[PDB]
Design a protein around this ligand. Sequence first.
Ligand SMILES: CCCCCCCCCCCCCC(=O)O[C@@H](CO)COC(=O)CCCCCCCC
Ligand SMILES: CCCCCCCCCCCCCC(=O)O[C@@H](CO)COC(=O)CCCCCCCC
Ligand SMILES: CCCCCCCCCCCCCC(=O)O[C@@H](CO)COC(=O)CCCCCCCC
Ligand SMILES: CCCCCCCCCCCCCC(=O)O[C@@H](CO)COC(=O)CCCCCCCC
Ligand SMILES: CCCCCCCCCO
Ligand SMILES: CCCCCCCCCO
Ligand SMILES: CCCCCCCCCO
Ligand SMILES: CCCCCCCCCO
Ligand SMILES: [K+]
Ligand SMILES: [K+]
Ligand SMILES: [K+]
Ligand SMILES: [K+]
Ligand SMILES: [K+]
Ligand SMILES: [K+]
Lengths: 96, 96, 96, 96
Amino acid sequence: WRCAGAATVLLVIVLLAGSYLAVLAERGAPGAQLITYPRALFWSVETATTVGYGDLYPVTLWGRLVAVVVMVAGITSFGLVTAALATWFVGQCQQQ
Amino acid sequence: WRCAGAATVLLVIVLLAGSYLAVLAERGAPGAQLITYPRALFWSVETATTVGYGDLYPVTLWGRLVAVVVMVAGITSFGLVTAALATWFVGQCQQQ
Amino acid sequence: WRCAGAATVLLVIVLLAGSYLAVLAERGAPGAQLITYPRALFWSVETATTVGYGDLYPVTLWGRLVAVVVMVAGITSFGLVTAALATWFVGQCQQQ
Amino acid sequence: WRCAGAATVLLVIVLLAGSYLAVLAERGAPGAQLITYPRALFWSVETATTVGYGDLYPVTLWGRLVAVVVMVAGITSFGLVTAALATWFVGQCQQQ
Ligand SMILES: CCCCCCCCCCCCCC(=O)O[C@@H](CO)COC(=O)CCCCCCCC
Ligand SMILES: CCCCCCCCCCCCCC(=O)O[C@@H](CO)COC(=O)CCCCCCCC
Ligand SMILES: CCCCCCCCCCCCCC(=O)O[C@@H](CO)COC(=O)CCCCCCCC
Ligand SMILES: CCCCCCCCCCCCCC(=O)O[C@@H](CO)COC(=O)CCCCCCCC
Ligand SMILES: CCCCCCCCCO
Ligand SMILES: CCCCCCCCCO
Ligand SMILES: CCCCCCCCCO
Ligand SMILES: CCCCCCCCCO
Ligand SMILES: [K+]
Ligand SMILES: [K+]
Ligand SMILES: [K+]
Ligand SMILES: [K+]
Ligand SMILES: [K+]
Ligand SMILES: [K+]
């Protein structure tokens, strides 16, 4: 019925697994700033929402490969979460 | 009928409340640049539209949590505002 | 019929008028880098497509107001241009 | 049937051809950082997904023209790849 929660679960899984694997892939490259889990979790949100401020980004092969998975899986899931919120909002747009 | 104004109202509420709570959450962290309301209002627009230049961004736990609300609520509402503008434009695309 | 060209015309108008008014609004503020028309035209593309690298952005009240018009009018028109390209691509996706 | 692979092929072609032509267009301008193929390939992903961190961007006329092609062709194709992933996910959203 409300599979929007299932897409929300998949989004949180991508945000958590992405931030965990990013720190795992970035530690080892001199100059890398995506090397601590707390700020790496907000980087996953920056990538999945496509906002991308640029304060945090990968600079390694794997780290950028992890970002690709966060892009493909996160933007799709976040697009499904924000689409359900759009449908619900219209459902009251006529109950004026 | 034209609930596009209702989504526009929700967008302005998210832009204003987001910029107000961001300054409230960022003041206190040394090095924070999102600490004045006027430029924080344009940061809300940068986030809601997903453009994200990167000249302004939060660096605190709460400030980033405020950004998440601006992302979830702002991108959904701005997506509804820009979708209604798209529909209206097509309505004249055949009145050539 | 192919109103996609009409949305393409509106996009070019927003890109040109936006880059012209941005330079007009940014010149006068010390430190502004969006002050020449050639690179301001690519800034309009960065904003309308929502990519937003961050190498160029407004720092004035009007300049940021011009960016809002480029966001509202440009993302809507570019969304219509890229949607027609998507429909056309599917039209051959079954002429295998 | 599953033309999603065809849009995926077009995306990879735009990512590869875009990163190849970007290095070809950027080498020659002092200060250009998009001058090696490996990191230019991730720049194509940053542009096509619209994330745009800002660590890499063109600064030449042609290089920015190449970016426009990566924007028009890449965002359209990546939008088709992520839309098929969204449809497939809903197909199991009711096989609970
Ligand atoms: C014409 C061909 C265009 C593309 C060629 C790409 C070749 C890949 C070879 C990888 C070697 C690593 C180079 C190196 O030692 O540098 C690493 C450390 O700086 C950075 O790694 C990287 O550059 C990351 C690779 C790009 C990410 C891939 C995006 C996936 C869609
Ligand atoms: C494997 C687990 C991966 C994720 C773990 C996250 C743990 C959160 C603990 C918070 C402690 C704060 C750390 C600190 O003192 O630093 C703050 C000041 O720099 C920055 O705050 C932050 O890092 C903000 C947290 C991330 C934003 C959350 C995004 C919501 C979707
Ligand atoms: C609680 C209220 C939150 C929002 C309050 C906003 C008040 C606006 C007053 C403008 C005074 C200019 C300040 C200044 O001298 O500085 C300018 C030069 O740095 C920068 O201009 C600016 O900050 C631009 C304003 C923000 C852009 C508006 C985005 C439209 C959606
Ligand atoms: C009112 C008119 C507004 C727009 C005018 C644009 C005129 C173009 C003339 C090009 C001359 C190059 C200037 C130069 O020597 O500088 C190059 C090296 O820095 C940078 O090239 C550039 O500025 C790139 C041009 C902008 C990209 C085009 C985006 C396409 C949608
Ligand atoms: C360099 C350490 C490799 C860690 C990569 C984790 C798995 C990445 C999958 O994209
Ligand atoms: C550190 C001050 C906390 C201010 C947070 C305001 C409410 C945030 C809701 O996301
Ligand atoms: C400071 C000079 C003002 C120029 C503004 C041009 C019109 C902007 C419309 O948003
Ligand atoms: C300055 C070298 C020109 C290279 C341009 C390659 C083709 C670009 C097509 O947009
Ligand atoms: K920077
Ligand atoms: K974006
Ligand atoms: K988008
Ligand atoms: K930046
Ligand atoms: K962006
Ligand atoms: K950026």
